[PDB]
Write a protein that binds this ligand. Sequence first.
Ligand SMILES: *Cc1c(COP(=O)(O)O)cnc(C)c1O
Ligand SMILES: *Cc1c(COP(=O)(O)O)cnc(C)c1O
Ligand SMILES: *Cc1c(COP(=O)(O)O)cnc(C)c1O
Ligand SMILES: *Cc1c(COP(=O)(O)O)cnc(C)c1O
Ligand SMILES: [Li+]
Ligand SMILES: [Li+]
Ligand SMILES: [Li+]
Ligand SMILES: [Li+]
Ligand code: NA
Ligand code: NA
Ligand code: NA
Ligand code: NA
Lengths: 431, 431, 431, 431
Amino acid sequence: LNDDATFWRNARHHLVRYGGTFEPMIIERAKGSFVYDADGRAILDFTSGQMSAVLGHCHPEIVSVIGEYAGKLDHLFSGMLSRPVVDLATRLANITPPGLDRALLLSTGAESNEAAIRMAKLVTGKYEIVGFAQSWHGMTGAAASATYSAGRKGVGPAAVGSFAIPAPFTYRPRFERNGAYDYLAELDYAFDLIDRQSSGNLAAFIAEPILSSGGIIELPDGYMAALKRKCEARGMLLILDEAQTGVGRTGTMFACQRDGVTPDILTLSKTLGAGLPLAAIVTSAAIEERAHELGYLFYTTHVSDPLPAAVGLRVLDVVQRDGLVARANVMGDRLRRGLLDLMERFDCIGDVRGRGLLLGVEIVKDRRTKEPADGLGAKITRECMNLGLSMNIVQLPGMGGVFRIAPPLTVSEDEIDLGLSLLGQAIERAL
Amino acid sequence: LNDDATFWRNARHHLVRYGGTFEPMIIERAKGSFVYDADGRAILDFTSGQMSAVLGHCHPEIVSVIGEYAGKLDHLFSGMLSRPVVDLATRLANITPPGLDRALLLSTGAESNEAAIRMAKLVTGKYEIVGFAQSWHGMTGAAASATYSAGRKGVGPAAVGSFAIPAPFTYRPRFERNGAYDYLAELDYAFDLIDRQSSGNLAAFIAEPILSSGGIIELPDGYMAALKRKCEARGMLLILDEAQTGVGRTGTMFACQRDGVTPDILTLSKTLGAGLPLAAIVTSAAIEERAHELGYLFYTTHVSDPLPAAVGLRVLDVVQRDGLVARANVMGDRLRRGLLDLMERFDCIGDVRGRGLLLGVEIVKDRRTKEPADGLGAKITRECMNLGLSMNIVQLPGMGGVFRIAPPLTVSEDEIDLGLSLLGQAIERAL
Amino acid sequence: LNDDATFWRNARHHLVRYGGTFEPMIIERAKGSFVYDADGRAILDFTSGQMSAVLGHCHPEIVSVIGEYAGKLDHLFSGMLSRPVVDLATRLANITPPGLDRALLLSTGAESNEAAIRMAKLVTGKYEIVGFAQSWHGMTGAAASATYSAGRKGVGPAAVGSFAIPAPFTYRPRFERNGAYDYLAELDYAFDLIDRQSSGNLAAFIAEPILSSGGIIELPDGYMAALKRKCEARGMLLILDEAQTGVGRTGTMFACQRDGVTPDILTLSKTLGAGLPLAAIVTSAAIEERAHELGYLFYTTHVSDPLPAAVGLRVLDVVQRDGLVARANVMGDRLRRGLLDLMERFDCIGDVRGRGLLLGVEIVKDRRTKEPADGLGAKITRECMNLGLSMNIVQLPGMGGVFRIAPPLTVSEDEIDLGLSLLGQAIERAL
Amino acid sequence: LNDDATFWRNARHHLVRYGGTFEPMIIERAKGSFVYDADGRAILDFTSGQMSAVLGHCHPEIVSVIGEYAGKLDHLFSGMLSRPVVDLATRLANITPPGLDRALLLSTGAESNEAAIRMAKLVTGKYEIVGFAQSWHGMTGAAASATYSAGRKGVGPAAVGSFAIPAPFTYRPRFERNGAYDYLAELDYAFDLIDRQSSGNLAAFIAEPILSSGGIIELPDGYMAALKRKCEARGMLLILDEAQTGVGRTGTMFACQRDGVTPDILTLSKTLGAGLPLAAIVTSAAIEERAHELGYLFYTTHVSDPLPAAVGLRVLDVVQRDGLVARANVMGDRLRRGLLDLMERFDCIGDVRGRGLLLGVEIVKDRRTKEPADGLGAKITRECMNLGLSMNIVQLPGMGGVFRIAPPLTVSEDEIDLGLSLLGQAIERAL
Ligand SMILES: *Cc1c(COP(=O)(O)O)cnc(C)c1O
Ligand SMILES: *Cc1c(COP(=O)(O)O)cnc(C)c1O
Ligand SMILES: *Cc1c(COP(=O)(O)O)cnc(C)c1O
Ligand SMILES: *Cc1c(COP(=O)(O)O)cnc(C)c1O
Ligand SMILES: [Li+]
Ligand SMILES: [Li+]
Ligand SMILES: [Li+]
Ligand SMILES: [Li+]
Ligand code: NA
Ligand code: NA
Ligand code: NA
Ligand code: NA
């Protein structure tokens, strides 16, 4: 049973609470798109853990490579190169757009964003960073100052020079020009303000292609292109954080590929490691040269370590080989149509957005008022769990709670169906 | 051969340079206290990689546990608990001093320090952080603002509220009271200044027990106790960063155990993971309760993940079981005596400091003037490498270059001897 | 002649240039609404010097009081009270709205704003200050961090916690709701953003009732009331800077009186001194009590000095006695109608705004496109000067150059007429 | 009587308390070295008001010039030059050392320091400012961030980039080298620390020649020269704040003249105005040229106003003409010898320091322990007042209360004697 008294004793006495509330189960094993409790019950992981497990739990190839490497090459002094590091770096250069040539292999998303932000400050000589008011870039330092989706309060002043602009949100537009939501005019309006407060030290803009923590908000068409134009005019670098979108999840290898705008620096993390801690930054040779001439430094205990790199390489090989990016469109299409059907059934479903296998469902009081449903989300989540479907909801000020759906790229048709089915039942049970 | 043209091509074209300069070898395999090149040459890892590999490379127990877990339980949603997480947290509570009860399991040293700094700000309501002028806490954000050993220049303003005090350095004392280096009077002098610049928001003091990046500088006797007293008087938390000293390296499970001063928050990392990315913070129940009531939040992709936790547990079991902490004193004694003998032979060796198996050798022009040797260090390092001994030197302003020695806790007598031997030969060759 | 070689030599060699460019005349004497050059030429001061001389130059009453006091009571130790200080403080309490009871007598506008900002931080315990993107509060410190109309660039980071919102500008509206410029919706939009970046330390909002440096921009109807509501909801103080509007200039003793919103702190300066350096803050007893309990401190060399206070009192007596506030409406009406007529004549005149005797004339390429006229303003100004009419233009990004008109409250009908006449001639000459 | 009920009513109801506590008298008239109460009682102003009245109260020449100008030329638009401004600027260039050529005429000490700090940031491109831990530069903005003698607490974070070093204090030395207070070694020690925390943006160092608010602490011999050397090596400007020392008070026209070190920027204020608000910055032509090319801007309502400038000129003429700088040495010698005699009489007098007519008397429990006398100072001050001698004491952490003595430069022998006499009586009465 999940009701182990010692287990729970020990958990209450010795774990630091870090947000949220522990599920009341003891996970004992994981495989593919499911996690199992102590009773053996199978729970469908519709979030890929913490949005990372792109190939599902314990994929045999990964299992196999972790294996080879753990007994052969594990961790090395930062100045020592090995084959997996060089192969992964090369691989990343080749599959990202032209213009992205050089990589730095790290451990976490926050490290990746820091490394990027540091390079951009060095290279430009400036220090002001601009991000979205609904961003999520990580909890450590700079990444944290650039994070506006949560954690700003009660912890003292943020980094000097941090500005934020509102992110384009089509579902609840707030900026109108001639009777229509004009998101590009909004962009212009936001930049003008920035321009007014800057001390003349704009160094970069950090953005997510699809704001995940922010409520699965997709930057609309033409946005990115205009964004990049705003940056160019001001001599700012554009850093794209693809922690959640990279590695096939939205139907393209990288989300930037859809828009056709290649950033100055690209950061990857969650999905690169497929569950393990691996992260990276990819930049142009020009930028790297300059940062080097300038004395750029970024040391971490695990930069360029063999084991993690080996793993990331294997992840890319699988994704490529098995056509997982394509699968993401097909499965994503399947899931999306099902969610639409749900929306036909229940008025509480106010919106279904996202791309590929990175979908959001905004729950609302009523489809016309678009009033956020107070407490329903949590019911729904609860019931899901009872029904065996792992979900994650996010609630932001001014918005209805949002379900972040993001199954493994290896998810099967049946699992998509099962999930859709349990989701329906949970909602019906919750009203 | 290490001279693979494709390999090197690819490395020059696709890797971001992050400090230092890549060794010109291709590491192909690692085992115990040695790494091997493409030619099969065995190099004695006297740094344990990046000071992490406490049990050496590819230790079979570790290999075996990485194994069990990679195929059973890998990565989970942050709100789901598992046995390895709870067991590791419990274990950490039990082997750290009384007063340290609750743990947070993360991935890196910088994350660990951030998590700690954030809690301390929350809990105290203040935001000013004090650290040493020679500290190393990591590159991301807050950790970085608290880091004074390197990376402060060219990257824009540091975090608001950062102060630094000089660290007690017995080898090159600079504060005298009545004819003697009075490090406690120095402490008083430093705090007075702080007190003058503070805005009245002192929240914490972050320190390393033995400054690693700073040149293997050990806080002298009675220092820590006075430090903690300074903090108490000002309502500040004392955070101890044991990334390099924790887990048996200096001859005690934790360095704080030698002094008998238990910190408010303890952070661990390099040696906990033994080469993998695992880190953690350990605090008192009181502090945790408060941070919780206050709404403390710290999310990371890999917080509480099963695999890494499993590994850390196995590391502790080995260290305990095999009496590695004791071994550290015995081997450490062996290495230290050898280094002293070298110092008998060569006048360039100005000091031999450190504890257990965390030793520093300061190279100087001349033993009396204590003038830093300009360029000798690098020669020596070069020769070492040629001789098959992996070393790492650090050079700080105003000090002679320092060799950081830190072999695996599983290092054998022979390896200690071999190392001592190659070191002698390299120095003789370098003059 | 104004062409004194020694004079000009000395000026080029020994004066620090601080912005702008010195007029090429030597002012020798000033009287009423005119200044005279070395040739004796009379120039009509349509700016009241630097918008301060509310009673004109060298008003006999002022002359007379400066006189009595300079030989009787001049400057005293900060802790010594005198009658003029107490009488001025009392007077200010009585003529400002209910709710404003206690005053602090200083020397400059920037000091006044600093004193206010400091009190607001003390009293609230918070530190974030919000201001307008087109504000002007002074050059020293906090006032400067709150100043967004100019001087942000090239001088290093601004004060931590500074935010700015766009100011309502009816002439060039940019925020639309349902086909109309909705300035209150803009306000809501701006605050939401603030709310997102704040660290939870909003202490105050500083605003001008009529943005002077910003281009003579009047806060529209209902704005101030909504502003104050925004502040109340967030526990923020509302500080009103009436340096240019206070003391009768816009037709009410204080501009806040028109809207009926009384601020938490009111600051006065330019017009209080009528040309001399006198400034002040007026707050409620409650706020003062609290700041006192909290240990509020604000020392300046000239706080509570007799001479300046004596002068300010005399200024208020004159304004009251001679009905200068009323006169401001009558004369203001006269000037405004004339400016409108000009606007009938010349298409370059795009807007005539302002209140009382604080008027702005925005010069534009063309009345429909509203394109800013590039260089015309300067011509016009030049010609004015030649014609004997002292003017001042301001040019802000995105706006047409703006003429700041602001004659003495003692200005006569003839002088208004003369001015209108020279202005017409200069424009005709400039096209 | 001083017991006017209405007066006191009005003062309690309408004045903002800004530090300290109002003396319980009503000052009605002032003349020379005395102020008079409502009862006509003459009080000997041994502080020159707030250390400003260098020529005493209501000096006839000043009275006479305030007169001429108030009715002729009062306040003008910032871009209009007049003779008093140019004459004062020229005068300042001529009487300050070679290297100081260009002046900016303002209103207050804080404005002066801001203007200076802004220029130094512009010209160097950097932003970090260094000052003394016991400094006093004013309350507004930058000046305030550089002020460490008081007001740092409870008002939010200081300006980014502010550092402070300890000031050399011979009476209570704390840094020893080879058995002696080595203040230059202290300087080296302090800079090293700075160097460690800087982000590489050191722009200037701001110092007072004799720390006034800090307890009348004189920078010892050779200090300034070493200071300036420290700055040069780091490409930093050295700004000297002579608000209290300038204009003859310490026996030289400017204190910098004694040491022979000419600063990059010199600021003046209290004594320049002799009681009125006049201030100024004096810099080299090179620095001014550069700041101009860079777009330096510094606008204030009263920059370059005629009246105040006229006054400052007259002050310099008097000081020069009447040989007041010399008188300061003679009178200063008289006062100092008397204070020494007191020190012979009473063990509570621990030190007599200062120069010219800027003297400090540190009261202590006991001459050997040097323990600060708790409460005696206040008694003494109280008695003085009763005896008719206006005094001012300052109390800093770790020091005995200090009496700031600073009579007018026009003080007579008799007044010096009287003062010495009342001081003795008050101390005798206080024990
Ligand atoms: C998760 C995430 C990060 C940070 O990754 P961590 O491993 O949590 O440090 C950064 N950006 C985005 C968009 C993320 O989703
Ligand atoms: C290495 C180190 C850290 C940071 O660990 P990373 O894995 O590099 O983020 C923090 N503190 C000390 C003392 C360290 O040695
Ligand atoms: C002029 C002005 C100030 C500052 O006054 P100074 O005397 O220049 O310091 C502040 N606010 C407003 C609105 C001003 O017009
Ligand atoms: C008084 C003083 C100032 C500031 O002058 P204010 O008129 O108070 O603004 C600056 N520096 C020193 C050394 C002072 O004594
Ligand atoms: Li490594
Ligand atoms: Li997890
Ligand atoms: Li005064
Ligand atoms: Li003027
Ligand atoms: Na590429
Ligand atoms: Na413990
Ligand atoms: Na009132
Ligand atoms: Na000079």
